[PDB]
Amino acid sequence: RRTVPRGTLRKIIKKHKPHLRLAANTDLLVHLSFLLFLHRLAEEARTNAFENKCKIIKPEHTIAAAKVILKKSRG
Amino acid sequence: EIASSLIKQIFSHYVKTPVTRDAYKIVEKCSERYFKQISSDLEAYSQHAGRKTVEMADVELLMRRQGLVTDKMPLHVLVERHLPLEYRKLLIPIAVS
């Protein structure tokens, strides 16, 4: 289930910057940076949980992780 | 405004271990924040190049700024590693290697 909702990506970016036009297929690289963001977030979260000896991912893990990874996601 | 099912499936696919409902809702929030942040960055790239479009070079620069694209880890490799064939075809119709 690796197929991306391209229209959706286009709409999200539209929502934030309605006058930005994405050229052909650039949405595919945007989606790629998103997958890499969630990959990083998944790894950071899992590490937090591991640090707690928590056998499942909890909100506090993802919260601290999101803070770290969003910082890493700056342009 | 991205589908929560897709986000849960990708996220679980990467995290590989069970996640609470609330944790997932957090990941969704973080995802919305991610798109807001990058939207502003791509605007800077475009506006700076004096154009109204996002170009491949813009998003590559993004990913380079994120520590993702490096000399050791070029974009084509991230594409090959992480995207399905039909997408790679579009992005790399000829080897850029």
From Swiss-Prot, chain B:
It is found in: Nucleus; Chromosome, Centromere; Chromosome, Centromere, Kinetochore. It comes from the Eukaryota. Component of the CENPA-CAD complex, composed of CENPI, CENPK, CENPL, CENPO, CENPP, CENPQ, CENPR and CENPS. The CENPA-CAD complex is probably recruited on centromeres by the CENPA-NAC complex, at least composed of CENPA, CENPC, CENPH, CENPM, CENPN, CENPT and CENPU. Identified in a centromeric complex containing histones H2A, H2B, H3 and H4, and at least CENPA, CENPB, CENPC, CENPT, CENPN, HJURP, SUPT16H, SSRP1 and RSF1. Interacts (via N-terminus) with the NDC80 complex. Component of the CENPA-NAC (nucleosome-associated) complex, a complex that plays a central role in assembly of kinetochore proteins, mitotic progression and chromosome segregation. The CENPA-NAC complex recruits the CENPA-CAD (nucleosome distal) complex and may be involved in incorporation of newly synthesized CENPA into centromeres. Part of a nucleosome-associated complex that binds specifically to histone H3-containing nucleosomes at the centromere, as opposed to nucleosomes containing CENPA. Belongs to the CENP-T/CNN1 family. The largest part of the sequence forms an elongated and flexible stalk structure that is connected to a C-terminal globular domain with a histone-type fold. Association with CENPA-containing complexes may be indirect and due to the proximity of centromeric nucleosomes containing histone H3 with those containing CENPA. This is Centromere protein T. The lineage of its organism: Eukaryota, Metazoa, Chordata, Craniata, Vertebrata.
